[PDB]
Scaffold this motif. Structure first.
Motif, PDB file in Angstrom:
ATOM      1  N   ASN A  84       0.813  -1.115   0.048  1.00  0.00           N
ATOM      2  CA  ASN A  84      -0.158  -0.017   0.213  1.00  0.00           C
ATOM      3  C   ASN A  84       0.840   1.211   0.101  1.00  0.00           C
ATOM      4  O   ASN A  84       0.468   2.394   0.461  1.00  0.00           O
ATOM      5  N   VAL A  85       2.025   1.028  -0.836  1.00  0.00           N
ATOM      6  CA  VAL A  85       2.870   2.179  -1.012  1.00  0.00           C
ATOM      7  C   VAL A  85       2.962   2.384  -2.441  1.00  0.00           C
ATOM      8  O   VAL A  85       3.325   1.452  -3.155  1.00  0.00           O
ATOM      9  N   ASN A  86       2.986   3.627  -3.215  1.00  0.00           N
ATOM     10  CA  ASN A  86       3.064   3.836  -4.315  1.00  0.00           C
ATOM     11  C   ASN A  86       4.321   4.033  -4.831  1.00  0.00           C
ATOM     12  O   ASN A  86       5.605   4.002  -3.851  1.00  0.00           O
ATOM     13  N   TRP A  87       4.714   4.233  -6.096  1.00  0.00           N
ATOM     14  CA  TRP A  87       6.033   4.147  -6.595  1.00  0.00           C
ATOM     15  C   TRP A  87       6.823   5.360  -6.072  1.00  0.00           C
ATOM     16  O   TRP A  87       8.139   5.208  -5.741  1.00  0.00           O
ATOM     17  N   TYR A  88       6.170   6.721  -5.960  1.00  0.00           N
ATOM     18  CA  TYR A  88       6.913   7.753  -5.326  1.00  0.00           C
ATOM     19  C   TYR A  88       7.131   7.640  -4.100  1.00  0.00           C
ATOM     20  O   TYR A  88       8.263   7.948  -3.404  1.00  0.00           O
ATOM     21  N   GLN A  89       6.304   6.978  -3.367  1.00  0.00           N
ATOM     22  CA  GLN A  89       6.721   6.730  -1.788  1.00  0.00           C
ATOM     23  C   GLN A  89       7.730   5.527  -1.732  1.00  0.00           C
ATOM     24  O   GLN A  89       8.545   6.006  -0.671  1.00  0.00           O
ATOM     25  N   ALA A  90       7.936   4.758  -2.499  1.00  0.00           N
ATOM     26  CA  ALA A  90       8.853   3.910  -2.559  1.00  0.00           C
ATOM     27  C   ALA A  90      10.380   4.658  -2.908  1.00  0.00           C
ATOM     28  O   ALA A  90      11.264   4.243  -2.095  1.00  0.00           O
ATOM     29  N   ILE A  91      10.346   5.253  -3.826  1.00  0.00           N
ATOM     30  CA  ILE A  91      11.626   6.083  -4.181  1.00  0.00           C
ATOM     31  C   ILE A  91      12.012   7.041  -3.070  1.00  0.00           C
ATOM     32  O   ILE A  91      13.267   7.164  -2.732  1.00  0.00           O
ATOM     33  N   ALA A  92      10.943   7.633  -2.465  1.00  0.00           N
ATOM     34  CA  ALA A  92      11.263   8.426  -1.314  1.00  0.00           C
ATOM     35  C   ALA A  92      11.906   7.769  -0.059  1.00  0.00           C
ATOM     36  O   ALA A  92      12.815   8.109   0.371  1.00  0.00           O
ATOM     37  N   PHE A  93      11.559   6.432   0.107  1.00  0.00           N
ATOM     38  CA  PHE A  93      11.801   5.601   1.173  1.00  0.00           C
ATOM     39  C   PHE A  93      13.319   5.429   0.901  1.00  0.00           C
ATOM     40  O   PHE A  93      14.234   5.288   1.733  1.00  0.00           O
ATOM     41  N   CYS A  94      13.497   5.052  -0.354  1.00  0.00           N
ATOM     42  CA  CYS A  94      14.862   4.741  -0.790  1.00  0.00           C
ATOM     43  C   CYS A  94      16.072   5.822  -0.508  1.00  0.00           C
ATOM     44  O   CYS A  94      17.063   5.590   0.092  1.00  0.00           O
ATOM     45  N   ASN A  95      15.593   7.148  -0.846  1.00  0.00           N
ATOM     46  CA  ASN A  95      16.412   8.236  -0.381  1.00  0.00           C
ATOM     47  C   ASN A  95      16.620   8.418   1.046  1.00  0.00           C
ATOM     48  O   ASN A  95      17.626   8.841   1.729  1.00  0.00           O
ATOM     49  N   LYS A  96      15.482   8.218   1.694  1.00  0.00           N
ATOM     50  CA  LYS A  96      15.540   8.452   3.248  1.00  0.00           C
ATOM     51  C   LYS A  96      16.523   7.346   3.999  1.00  0.00           C
ATOM     52  O   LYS A  96      17.428   7.657   4.638  1.00  0.00           O
ATOM     53  N   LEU A  97      16.592   6.207   3.222  1.00  0.00           N
ATOM     54  CA  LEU A  97      17.484   5.071   3.975  1.00  0.00           C
ATOM     55  C   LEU A  97      18.657   5.418   3.452  1.00  0.00           C
ATOM     56  O   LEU A  97      19.570   5.405   4.468  1.00  0.00           O
ATOM     57  N   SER A  98      18.972   5.845   2.341  1.00  0.00           N
ATOM     58  CA  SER A  98      20.238   6.222   2.056  1.00  0.00           C
ATOM     59  C   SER A  98      21.000   7.294   2.987  1.00  0.00           C
ATOM     60  O   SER A  98      22.155   7.059   3.604  1.00  0.00           O
TER      61      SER A  98
END
Ligand SMILES: [Ca+2]
Ligand code: NA
Length: 278
Positions: A84-98
């Motif tokens: 229940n996460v969209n593609w934008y939310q997924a890429i945002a997670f990736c950056n925040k994790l980095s």
């Protein structure tokens, strides 16, 4: 083969699995839109598991998952995949994790001409519908941060060094041992790493949740050639997701079955798996 790496965010650990540089033989004659083709891939790492609810929350401070309670008997809720996460939310997670792990972010987004600061970015600022600025997200594949796999990276890793239709098996009969799919899921996601891995050591490549990839969808036809580390076409209408889910037929979970949806869309059977480079 890059050495596997285990990272920690607070109390949450996750593992990235090394995949050697290769001329990946992808697609299959039986897929009209995924015909046989080769993509030269640089060495990379891909998540041992899907991103779990506890990893998601450790980074994002919320949990939008549809299946946020009532786990199956013997299963740990927090170790179910986020969905229940969209593609934008997924890429945002990736950056925040980095950023949390002191790695340079792979993604850049400009909103109205202003570069998004992904550290400062709040969840409600990420679009929940198709958004032109976020659709023009830029990937720098040479940064060391986390990101979505390209479709070629995903499929090559999913194949696990074999030519089987599924990740770990060539019959629907044996699929239950490798995947949580329509027949055996009980209409819900499951704790990650509860079924058999493929030979590259990846779990739930088939089933559980489908997994967002970087690429825009375009049909791959007979004889098509692709550049090294191909990240897909520059434009499209839907972003690729792969691997099938708890909701899908066995065929939906096949390593070569291509699916795509609008990047603003999110569902209870769609999450994601990380990639990065050493
Ligand atoms: Ca999956
Ligand atoms: Na295939």
């Amino acid at each position: 083969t890059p050495v596997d790496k285990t990272y920690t965010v607070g109390s949450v650990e996750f593992t990235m699995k090394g995949i050697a540089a290769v001329n990946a033989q992808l697609g299959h004659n039986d897929y009209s839109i995924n015909q046989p083709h080769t993509v030269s891939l640089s060495a990379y790492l891909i998540g041992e598991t899907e991103v779990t609810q506890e990893l998601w929350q450790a980074v994002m401070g919320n949990n939008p998952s549809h299946f946020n309670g009532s786990p199956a008997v013997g299963e740990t809720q927090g170790k179910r995949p986020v969905e229940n996460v969209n593609w934008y939310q997924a890429i945002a997670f990736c950056n925040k994790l980095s950023i949390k792990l002191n790695l340079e972010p792979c993604y850049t987004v400009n909103v109205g001409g202003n570069p998004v600061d992904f550290a400062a970015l709040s969840f409600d600022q990420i679009p929940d519908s198709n958004n032109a600025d976020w659709d023009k997200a830029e990937l720098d594949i040479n940064k060391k941060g986390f990101r979505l796999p390209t479709e070629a990276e995903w499929e090559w890793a999913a194949k696990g060094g074999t030519d089987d239709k599924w990740s770990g098996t060539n019959t629907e009969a044996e699929l239950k041992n490798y995947a949580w799919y329509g027949s055996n899921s009980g209409s819900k996601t499951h704790e990650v790493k509860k079924k058999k891995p493929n030979w590259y050591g990846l779990y739930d490549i088939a089933g559980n949740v489908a997994e967002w990839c970087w690429d825009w969808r375009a049909d791959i036809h007979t004889g098509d050639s692709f550049p090294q580390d191909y990240p897909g076409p520059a434009s499209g209408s839907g972003r690729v997701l792969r691997g099938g889910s708890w909701a899908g037929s066995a065929d939906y979970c096949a390593v070569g079955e291509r699916v795509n949806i609008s990047p603003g869309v999110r569902c209870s059977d769609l999450g994601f798996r990380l990639a990065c480079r050493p």
